[PDB]
Structure formats: C-alpha cells, structure tokens
Amino acid sequence: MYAVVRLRGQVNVRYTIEDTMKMLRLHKVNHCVFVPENPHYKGMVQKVKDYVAYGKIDAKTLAEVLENRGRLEGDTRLTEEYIRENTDYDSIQAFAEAVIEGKSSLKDIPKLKPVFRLHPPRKGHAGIKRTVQQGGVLGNHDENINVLLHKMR
Amino acid sequence: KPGSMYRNVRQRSFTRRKYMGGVPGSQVIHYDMGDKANTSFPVKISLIVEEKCQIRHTALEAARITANRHLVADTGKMGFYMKLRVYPHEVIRENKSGMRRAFGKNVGTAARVKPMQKIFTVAVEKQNFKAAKEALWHAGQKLPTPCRIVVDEGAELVQ
Amino acid sequence: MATGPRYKVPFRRRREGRTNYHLRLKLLLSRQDRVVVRKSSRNVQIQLIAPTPDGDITYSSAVSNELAKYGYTGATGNTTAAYLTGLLFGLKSLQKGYEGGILDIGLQASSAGSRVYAALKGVVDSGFEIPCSPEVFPPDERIRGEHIAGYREESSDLPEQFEATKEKIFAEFS
Amino acid sequence: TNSHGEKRCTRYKLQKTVRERGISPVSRAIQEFEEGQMVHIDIDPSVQKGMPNPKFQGSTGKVIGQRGRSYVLEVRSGNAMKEVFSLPQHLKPQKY
RNA sequence: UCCGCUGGUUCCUUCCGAAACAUGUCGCAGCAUGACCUGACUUGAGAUCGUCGGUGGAGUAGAGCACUGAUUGGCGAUUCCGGGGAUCCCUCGCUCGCUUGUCAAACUCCAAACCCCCCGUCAUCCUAGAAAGUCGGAGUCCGGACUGCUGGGGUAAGCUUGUAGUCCGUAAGGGAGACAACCCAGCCCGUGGUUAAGGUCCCCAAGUGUCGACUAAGUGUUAAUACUAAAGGGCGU
RNA sequence: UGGGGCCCCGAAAAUUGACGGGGCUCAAGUCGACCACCGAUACCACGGAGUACCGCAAGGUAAUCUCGUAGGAAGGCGUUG
RNA sequence: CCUGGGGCGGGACGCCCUUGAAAAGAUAUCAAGGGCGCGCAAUGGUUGACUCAAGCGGGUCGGAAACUCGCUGAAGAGUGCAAGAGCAUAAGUCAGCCUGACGUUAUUCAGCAUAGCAGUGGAUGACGAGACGAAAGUCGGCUCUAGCGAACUUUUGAGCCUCCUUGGUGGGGGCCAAAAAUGACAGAAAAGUUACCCCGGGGAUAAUUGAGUCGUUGCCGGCAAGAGUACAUAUCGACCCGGCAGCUUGCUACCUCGAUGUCGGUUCUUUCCAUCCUGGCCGUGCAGCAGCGGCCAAGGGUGAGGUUGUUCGCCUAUUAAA
RNA sequence: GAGUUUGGCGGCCAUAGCGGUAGGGCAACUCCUGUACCCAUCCCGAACACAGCAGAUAAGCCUGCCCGCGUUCCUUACUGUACUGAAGUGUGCGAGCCUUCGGGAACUCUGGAUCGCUGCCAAGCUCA
Ligand SMILES: [Mg+2]
Ligand SMILES: [Mg+2]
Ligand SMILES: [Mg+2]
Ligand SMILES: [Mg+2]
Ligand SMILES: [Mg+2]
Ligand SMILES: [Mg+2]
Ligand SMILES: [Mg+2]
Ligand SMILES: [Mg+2]
Ligand SMILES: [Mg+2]
C-alpha cells in the first residue's frame, strides 16, 4: 500500500490541491497516512505530487511506526496489550504483516486515529524544491520511502 | 524608422488584405536568381535563422542584392541558382493626439520567420563551393537575426 | 458527384429517387399509422406501416394477386382490381386489430378517379376508418366495367365477376 | 458598441458539418421521452422553430413534462435551475 | 440655513470576518438593487472542493490548403474579355490546368492538452443537523502586485486596458544588505528537542570540506526581480 | 571544416564609493556530483489558558480549534445619582 | 456627461452581426470591420409543377452583346436592406385559390450568465373563428438574429359603473385597448462671460523640478557597394543591420496643490570627457612651411566688444585657442 | 420448419460516391403498345392518367470483378516530434526558453483493406 508523507505547508497553494489534501487527511507537514493501491487513490496522489512524497511500504517500517507514533482516541499511546486483546494477532509485527498483505486493515483497531504525526527528519532531507529524479525529496520514491520514513522515526 | 522598432514577435498576426487599407508596395522584384532552367547542381546549401523575429522587406532586398553581386562576380552568371523563400505577408503600422485613439496606420510590410527555417538557397558546382559560402555570409550580415549556414545536399562531396 | 471532400452526397433513398423526406417528416407528426398504396402495371399493393428506430414494421400487407383464389379472373391493372384489393385489405386489417391511419400516396399524382383513390374507396367502404373526402372517389360507372368499354366491347363479362368477387370477399372475411 | 441580442457569438456554434448539411434525419424528430429521463441538448440548425437559447448547448437536463410537441427540461446554469422548452428534434437521449 | 466636499468622534476581553465587482442613475469624489460578511429561526437527509470510467459539447494551440482571400518560379494552353505597332502580318500581360516556394485575427478537409453538463464508483462533510427557506444589521462599487495567456493597444515604459491562480490591503516569525505583495511559514502562554528556506574564510552561528575539470579577465563573487549591455570578431585557451 | 565551455575586444558621464564590506587566483570564482554541521513561533514532547459542541452533573472529544482591517455578535470594568 | 488633465474633435450616450475572447459560460479600452431609426396588397399564406450560377457543342449581320436545342453542374444562384448562419422534389422560380399582416389569454427564456431590475420580444401552449390541401399538415406577416419609448394628459372604439336626501335632463369622473414623445433613447419645460472674481476640496487631475522610456535628438560600431587618373579602407562612404548618453522635443501620471518661489544675466565653487589650445605618438595621394585623419592625456588655459530680455545665433578686432 | 429469389416501407447517411468492364429475366419489376373515358400540357398522351396484349434483357434492377479519382480504417517512420496540465532558488541583456511527473497530434511515408452493412412484411418457391 501507499505511504503519503506531507512535506510542504499550505501558503500560496491552489484551492483544488488544498481540498484534495484535506480529503486525504493531510493537514500539516510531517504527517503521514496509509492508503490502499487502487485507481482512485492513485489519481488523488498523482494530483498532489509536488507537496508530498510517497511509495510502497513494507512490514518492518509500518510495524515500527505503529509501535512508536500510534495514538488512540484521546491522545493515548498504543501498546502491545491493546493489539493483543482487541484484535486477534499476537503482536505488532504479525498485525503489520497482516495489514500489508491486505488481509487486515487499520479499521480493525478501535479508536485509532487515521493520521500519523511523525517527527521532523533527523539528519535533514534532500530538499523541497526538486523531485526525486532531480535530486530532491518530492514525488514518487518507489521502495525508498522506507529510508525517509525510517529517518523520521 | 530604426530596425529594432519592428523586429520582435509580441502580438498577433495582422495580414488580411481585405480588412485593412492602403498597404504600401514592395521593393523586391524577383525571387528567383540565376539559371532557373538548370536542375543539375549537386551541392545545395542554404542560410537558416537562429531565432524568431520579423524581417522588413528592405532588409531582404539588400541581402538579395549583395548576394547577387558576390555570386555573379565570382561563380559566374550561369553557375548558380539562388532562390529567396519567405515572402512578406505581415503588415507594419506606426502611430501618427498622444495615446488617444493610439491605433496605428499601415506603413510597411514584414515577413515573420521561425527558428531553423531556411531563408536563402544556393546551388553550385563543386569548384565554386567556397564562393557560395562567401556570398551567403555577407547576405546574413544585413539580416536582423543571427544566421548559420548548412550544407543540405552533397555534404559528403564537400566534406 | 464526389469530386472532393466537401461534396455532399444525398441519402440512399434519395439517390434511388424513391422517397421524399419532407413529406415523410410531415406524415410522421400524426403519431398514427400510414396506409401505403404503391402501384405498378401488373398489379397493385396495399399495406399498413408504422415507424420504429430500427426500421418500419408492417402489420398488414394485401396484394391484388390474392383475388386469384376468390375468382377475380379479370385484369389486375384496372380500377376494379384496386377496389377489390382495398376491400379485402380493409376487412383483413379490421379483423386483425388495426382500424385507422393516414392515406399516403408517396411520390404519385393525386388525381380523382385514379386507382389509388379506388383503393381508398375500397378501404372506406369496409369500415376501416380513414380521413378523406368523397369528391375524389371514382364513380362506380368506371368501377364496374365501363373504363374498357370503348376498345374491348367483346369483353364485357366484368360486372357479374365483380359481384361474385365482392360477395366472396365478404364471405371469407365475415 | 457590441450588441447583446439572442444570436451573438454563434458563428461556429450554429453551423452544420460539411457532410451533414441539408435535410436532417427524420427519425430524430419522432423520438419519445418519459418522465425523469436524462437528455442532451444538441441544437440542430436546420430547424428554425422551437430552438432554446444556444447558451444551453451541450448541457444535460431531465424531462419534466410535455406541452404540445415540446418537452420541458430542467437545466442547471451556474447554481440555478432553468426551465427550457425544446422540440424533440434538438434533443438526444443519454446512453447508459 | 444647506453640501454628495475637508477634520474629529473617549473603557476591556471573547466568537466570526469581507468588497474595491455587475445593472440603473444629469451617473463618474454620490446613491439604489444584487454578489460577498454576520445573528436568529423553520424544515428534516442528503451534498460535492477531489479521484477513476462512460454517454455528450467543442473549433482554441498546432497543422494544412479541401472553401474564402492572398502568394513564388518552370511547363502547356486560354486560339477570347487584353497592351505592343487591310490578311489584325505575328509579338502576347490578365486568365485557365500540371509541378515548385510562402501565408491568414474576422480561412478550415483536420485537430489536441485545460475546461463544462450528466450517470456510476471511491473519498470527505452530515441527525451534535445536508440541501432549501424566512427575518434583522451592515460594510463595499479610488485598488495594487507576482506567476502564466507569443493576452489587446503602444517605438517603448515602474505605461494603459483584460483574464486564471495566489497574495498585499488586513499577515506575525525565519532568510534575502535594506525590500507592502520574492523563498520557508499562516501566530494562545512557558520549557526542552529536531528540522525547513538559506548558509558554513572574517564581519556572523556552523567547512580555509571531498572528488573531476575550467577561467587569468579582480572577469566573477547578483534565484525571481521595474536593479543585470547588443550585432560582429578572436592563428586567447 | 563543422559543433560546443569559459574569457578578450567592441565598452564614454558628470560630489568620493559600493560583490552588503574586508578580501579572494590548483579560489573565498564557474560547471558536474557528494558528505557533515548550523539555522524559525514550522514539526515532536510536557504543563497551563480560552473557545466550539455534547452531557442532569461529574466531565467528555478537538490531526480535522486559536492571524486580522471595514463590519456583525456575546460577556465584563469604571463615573454620578 | 464621456474624455490617457480640461478644451477642440467626435458619441464608443438606444438597438443588431463578426473578431478581440485564451475549444462550457462571463470578460475592458476614444479596440478592429460595420449597419439600423426602413420598404412591400404583394416582395404575404397554402397547394401544384420545376431547378438555379458558369462553362462546352449548334443555329441567320440575333457579332466575341440577345433567343433557342443537348451535355457537365450539392449550389459555385436566389432568398428586399449590414454581418453571420439556414435552405434542392426546398426556405428558391412560375401558376391556381386566398388574407393567419385574425380577437382574447397562461407560462418559460433573454434583455439583466452565475444573481435583484420597465417596456417589450420569442418560444411553447389554451379559447373563438378561418385559408389552402385527398389527407397529414402549414399559416400569430415578408428563412433566423436590428427597424424603437414609462407615469401624467388629450383623442378614438365596445359595453358597462358613477356624481354627495330622492327622480330626470345637459355636462363631468372611471374601467379595458389603440394613436400622439421624451434620439442625453430606464424619459428637466433651458444660452454665454469673468484677467474684477469669491468659497470648499484635489497631487482622486494639468504648467515644470524629480523618476521611468527613447519614437525623435547627440555620439559610435558591422558589412563594405562605389569614388579617389591604377588602388574600398591617405581621404569620403551608400543600402541594410546593432548600440551608448540622457545634454532637444515627445510619451506616461509614480511624488508635491493646509505653496519645494519661474526665464536670462551677475558672483563663487566644483565634477565629466565625447580634446578647442598647450604635452607625446601613428598614417598620408607627408620635399620644407602648413595641412588631412586617428590614438594617449582632464595638469593649466578658454578673453574683449555692437544688435537683441534672450538661451541660441549673427558680426567686429585680437588671440596659442578664444 | 431453414434457405434462396423477387417486391414494397425503412435505419446508419460516400466503407454507400465517380468512372470501367462481363454476365441474367422462368415467377417479379422495367422497358414497352395506344388515347374511349376521370386526367394534362404556359404548345406537345414528353411527363402525369387510363387502357394493355406483343418483343426485349439493348437500357433501369440483380450478380462478379477493376485501385483508375474521392471517402473510411490499420500498420512502418516522421515521433513520443509539435503543442500542452502541475511544480521549479533552472536559464537569457531582451523578445524568450529549459528540467521532472502526466497527456499527445496534423500532414507526409512503406505496406495492406474499403466498388456498402442491415430491420419489417408479402409472394413464388425450394425440405421434412
Ligand atoms: Mg495558428
Ligand atoms: Mg460609498
Ligand atoms: Mg505571489
Ligand atoms: Mg491574507
Ligand atoms: Mg517579514
Ligand atoms: Mg472591528
Ligand atoms: Mg468632465
Ligand atoms: Mg476693467
Ligand atoms: Mg480657493
């Protein structure tokens, strides 16, 4: 599935792109969301390519993000016990594998906030004036969204 | 008026004869030069343009005159076939009050061009190739745009 | 006359020259059936046709050749043959379920005493409803046997045959 | 001054294709619609009568009723609803 | 006295927050009605700022000569409508066809990318009240700028008049030497932490950093920009 | 002979002077890449205030609340009686 | 009233078409091309019969100017008048019969996207009467989009209501429609001057100081056509092309109208170089003297008088140069 | 009950048109024979109308074919070219242009196809 991370703010931006962004739950820089791989989401992500990065996410990075920056209803940290007693998978790693396989989703965790609020990228990123093919950080990354996501643990 | 007054392409074309009025004539008399009835010149070089602009007809006439003189002086009267290509279809207008009803009136004619678009073409034998280059280099000196020379046919012969 | 890409070629039924589309547009505005009375030399044809986006479906189609069963052993190109054909067509269509429509003569001259108006007479006398006026209906003096009198006096066996065919037409369709 | 009549800026709007001029097909005039049936506005220049304002060209309305030989449509312009009368010769169904 | 014209109009916090535009006007320094802002109430289930697919509208960019106007030579004839000097002795332009070379804002046999109506789907909002409706109070009709449209006009202009988006007006804080509208960012108070734009010889926080070449002119050391010199030439490298 | 990079000539203005200044030459300039660090009220964490909506109250939710001129609305302070 | 200040000129002051206008809709300028303030009892309605423009071939002076016959001919014609669109068994041409160029009345659309605004027009209809046609159907003028005006007032048409205690006569008032006009066309009964002027405002708007631009002005460059008895370059330099300065005049309206004191001369100080003399060099169609052309150089010098307010310019005698 | 042929009314409206060529009429259409009657000519039984037997497939109509003009379609190149939506501290003295992600022609070129497809009904027939 995709991993959309916002990296530019919201001043001097078209209203169509802004409304697509708010429809994707992304309101602030350094915020991440996880969406399935279907043509609707593919087009929606294609329309905001110059303000977010994205790519294919693996099991390890998703499990790490869930264990670190997962909040419940009311700003309550997510723990192993919540996963092991609400859903059926043993630990965060098994649930992450199930989610990435498409056999499960993040809707199976009650009171889970859809948006993930990450930390600014340690060591600094490439730059928000160029796309990936130009030597920057915006645009499609393919499988290398894990490097940027791990950098923003 | 000066040359740079009407040389840029900033506005739409203005060429419909039946709507405007009183366009002055032209000076360029003949658009084909030299041996028209010959068709057996193995080398065919030409002068091309490096940038979009407008060329007045007077500049074209001066370039044609100078190229004709050089080519006839060196190559010979029957040893070439020069042919101008672009005809001036545009019309030039000069305001002449202040800005009150500032729309102008016809004063001349111009021929728009496009990058890498051929203007002149000279065909010669093998022995008069350098004279052809020498002739085409002076003609581009009267022209309002940077110009380069390309050998279209018989490149292997000369090169 | 296709000489270039701008040339305009007419419709297929206009190139054939067997239709008039302005008349067709005027006729379809009635929202109701049409009666077609196209004729030829060896016989006459009558049929009821209604429109559809694909084609023109037809419900009843009677032809003057059908008098051979009844016994109309006379000429099939006369007015009385047209009257007989129209009469049996009217009875057939009435019993079938359809009753009315509009008269449509196509690209033919509408002149009183014609075979088309003879067929119209045969239709109207049968009970098949149709809008018309009587002044164009041919008088029965030519209907019976008397439009061939002046050249075929040796053949005046018409009126008895006409009566027999009329009574047999009534007998079959009643 | 520019005029503001009812046929302004319709040089190409009210033209017919080169292999279309003349008598239009007649079956298009006898098509019949029911209530709540989406249709397309496509003005046929060959017919002079019963023509909506050409600003409704290319819009889609739904049929509301019939007045004689003309259907009543419900077209959206901007954020309003406009009721437009049009004979069935200018209309065209929606293929689902 | 009166003015559509000039100056002034006194305490605190909290919630929301514009228009500098259209039509009429003895109208142009004014006013009315509408768009846009705000408060209350009625009703009770959908709405579409966005994506994908389809039924439809194209006549702009580009391209081209098939219509309308122009346009360059060669060839063959108009045995004309025509100008050159008694069988019009014969020259022969305009014109008609085949080939070559150019065009069009009021040309089109063609023809996009944006865009608009509708259907289905996803997505967001919504009984803590969608869409619609009723009533109360206004301000506003001197705008300006940047990026696109070869926008129109003009020799050009930090000129004048349009249009899409976003801004200043009414926008802090960080960086550009200073900079209304340029880049990052839209901001309740206090403390800790990591980054963006941009930078790292000294002024000045952090590199006299790494790899491979170029320049010998103090050229340069100046994202955009109203602040930055051209044609032409050089056996300079 | 053709195609490219940088530089030179072409190149003249009025108070003394503007790469921001000092200065800078295998660079402290130009071109193609790369590494580390600095640097906001942005983003993360903790505590606090207010607001919006709900709840009988206790209290609950807020990534989807906290800029502001013309202007609309709500609650308070003060003077004399 | 509009107005690249006002004036003068004009009307972009009402209506209709094409482009500008950026392929939905909207969109400005004293933007480009323009037109209308009418004509017709047939140039109108319907049915029937036909096909037009232009060429080619033939016929008597029917001349390359006539009418007729045959062929090709989707339109190259005509349709009252601008532009654009429409039209072929026709919306065109001719013949027959006719007057729907009818009385009354309801919605919706545009004028006036979205999104209020007369009168008034155009599309569907309804009632009552007709014309043409076998019928279907067409007809609410002339194929579609221009040819026009509120309230109040007068006049005209059909029938009714009404005038103050009651009834009548004469005369008034009213309802519905038509005509008479406000072109500044959403509708005042309307000429000038002020340097004798007064008041309130404006840099929302001009003289000219400044800033921007450089058409024009001053000064150069590129190519060199040619002249120079031969020789483009001792000397002069065409056509075309490219610039610099802001020292002439224009263009714009960014600052200043609760005031930045105008032209010329005088006095005194300074800056630039694009060099008139003085210093140094190069070429020559440089014998000498003296010239002609160019390069470096801004240290010093650059005056006295007649006319004229003059700057500018003309003239006089000196001077190394004035 | 399936198919063929003929006839009429049609849908898409040149893939259907233009030109050329070889075959067919038994049932059917047509050509084709005349003017008593209804009907007709701005004159003409030309046409329309009526009355219809003769002969003919020379014409209309039907079947087969032709790339010779015009139209429609596919493929090779031109070419992911021209043009263009979004973002850019990318670049030019200037009029301008470049990089990334996403769309994407027109003519012309090599080679092939296109000389219509199709709906309703009736009649003669042809079978089980
Ligand atoms: Mg173009
Ligand atoms: Mg006001
Ligand atoms: Mg901006
Ligand atoms: Mg703002
Ligand atoms: Mg700031
Ligand atoms: Mg306030
Ligand atoms: Mg005035
Ligand atoms: Mg006096
Ligand atoms: Mg005063």
The distinct bound ligands, ions and cofactors come out as: magnesium ion
Number of strands of chain D: 5
What is the alpha-carbon Rg of chain A in Å?
A: 15 Å
Residue share in β-strands of chain A: 5-15%
Most residues in contact, chain pair and counts = C-D, 14 and 11 residues
Biggest sheet: strand arrangement of chain A = 6-2-1-3-7
Helical content band of chain A = 25-40%
Please estimate the helix content of chain D: under 10%
Query: In percent, how much strand structure appears in the residues of chain D?
Result: 25-35%
- The shape of chain A is globular
The main sheet of chain A comes to: 5 strands, mixed
The helix tally of chain D amounts to: 0
Secondary-structure element string of chain D: EEEEE
Structural class of chain A: alpha+beta
Gap between N and C termini of chain D, in Å?
Answer: 46 Å
Radius of gyration of chain D (Å): 14 Å
Oligomer: part of a larger assembly
Account of the 3D structure:
This is part of a larger assembly, with chains A (153 residues), B (159 residues), C (174 residues) and D (96 residues). Chain A is α+β, with helices and mostly antiparallel strands. Chain A is 33% helix and 11% strand. Chain A contains six helices and seven strands. In chain A, the strands form two sheets. A five-stranded mixed β-sheet of chain A has the order 6-2-1-3-7, with no helix packed on it. In chain A, helix 3 (59-69) crosses helix 5 (92-100). Chain A is globular and about 45 Å long. Chain B is α+β, with helices and mostly antiparallel strands and 159 residues long. Chain B is 21% helix and 23% strand. Chain B is built from three helices and six strands; from the N terminus they run ββαβββαβα. Chain B has a three-stranded antiparallel β-sheet with strand order 5-1-6. The radius of gyration of chain B is 18 Å and the shape is elongated. By secondary structure, chain C is α+β, with helices and mostly antiparallel strands. Chain C is 38% helix and 12% strand. Chain C is built from seven helices and four strands, in the order H-H-E-E-E-H-H-E-H-H-H. In chain C, strands 3-2-1-4 form a four-stranded mixed β-sheet, with helices on one face. Chain D is mainly β. The radius of gyration of chain D is 14 Å and the shape is globular. Classes of the chains: A alpha+beta (153), B alpha+beta (159), C alpha+beta (174), D mainly beta (96). It is classed as ribosome. The entry lists the keywords Archaea, Methanosarcina acetivorans, Large subunit, 50S subunit, growth conditions, acetate, ribosome.
